[PDB]
């Protein structure tokens, strides 16, 4: 169980065996090891990784001390990969080989306050035939006096996206260690520039 912190660059397609393969390009490494959660100290196993250097004259004293105890320069981000104990002190793209399958976690693009048709694929109303100001409305939200209420988890309008999403079992199309590049076939959550996490797959 291995992971790395990353950055979604953008999409393209490459050509492999006379097939066009859409890819998302991710800048993964290098991720220095900042803290090691152990069963003795913390109750579980995990590495705290770091990612992207930060202006040392921009990192407050509580974080300065934390980096110091590891002997690492200030990084912009800390994230834990759970159940990962890499041998070295720096995780790079070369933990992945082409052909391996990975799960990728990013923050979806935010639709803001979203209607029931965009958020939940509701059917809306008719656009003619007498329909009266309900073309995008959800219709009924319940029954009558029994139960006289609205279910919890009811699908309604509200904020949509800008949430944690994991897409699973993406094929690794290439590793370019000279540039810390990881090509993964298909779509990855979030905008270009967004932070993402690449873990070995959990599908068998």
């Amino acid at each position: 169980m291995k992971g790395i912190l990353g950055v979604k660059v953008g999409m393209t397609r490459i050509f492999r065996d006379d097939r066009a393969v859409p890819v998302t390009v991710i800048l993964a490494g290098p991720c220095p090891v900042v803290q090691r959660r152990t069963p003795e100290k913390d109750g579980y196993t995990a590495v705290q990784l770091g990612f992207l250097p930060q202006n040392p004259k921009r990192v407050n004293r509580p974080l300065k001390g934390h980096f110091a105890k590891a002997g690492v320069e200030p990084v912009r981000i800390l994230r834990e990969i759970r159940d990962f104990n890499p041998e070295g002190d720096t995780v790079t793209v070369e933990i992945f080989k082409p052909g391996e399958r990975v799960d990728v976690t990013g923050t979806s693009k935010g639709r803001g306050f979203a209607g029931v048709m965009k958020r939940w694929n509701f059917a809306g109303g008719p656009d003619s035939h007498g329909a009266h100001k309900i073309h995008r409305h959800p219709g009924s939200i319940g029954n009558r006096k029994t139960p006289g209420r609205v279910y919890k988890g009811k699908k309604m309008a509200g904020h949509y996206g800008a949430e944690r999403v994991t897409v699973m079992n993406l094929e690794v199309v290439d590793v370019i260690p000279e540039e810390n590049l990881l090509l993964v076939k298909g779509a990855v959550p979030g905008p270009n520039g967004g932070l993402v996490i690449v873990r070995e797959t959990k599908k068998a």
Binding site: K109, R111, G112, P191
Partner: protein
């Protein structure tokens, strides 16, 4: 959503917003400094900077392009003869926007000055 869209709307339709920019342009280039609302000011910088830059180039094409917006030959001649030579060695930033301390009384509007630079 508005993801990566450039340009304020200023609650004007397409032709009203262009004329607003053109009129502000004429006024600023006429007096060298104007007061508007902060949002209008900030939008004015780009519009006027582009006309000043074309006036730095100073060819007939530039003059005719600027006239599409400014319309007033006397004012363009001023822009080409008096305004633009001030900026021959300045690479952008031909205008500055400074925010004013006090809001308009009738609608609380925050005001700013927009001026051509030295």
């Amino acid at each position: 959503m508005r993801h990566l869209k450039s340009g304020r709307k200023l609650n004007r339709h397409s032709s009203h917003r262009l004329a607003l920019y053109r009129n502000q342009a004429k006024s600023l280039l006429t007096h060298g400094r104007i007061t508007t609302t902060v949002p209008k000011a900030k939008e004015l910088r780009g519009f006027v900077d582009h006309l000043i830059h074309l006036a730095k180039r100073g060819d007939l094409h530039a003059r005719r392009l600027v006239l599409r917006d400014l319309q007033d030959v006397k004012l363009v001649r001023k822009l080409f003869d008096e305004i633009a030579p001030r900026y021959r060695d300045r690479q952008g930033g031909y205008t500055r926007v400074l925010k004013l301390a006090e809001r308009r009384r009738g609608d609380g509007a925050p005001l700013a000055l927009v001026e051509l630079v030295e």
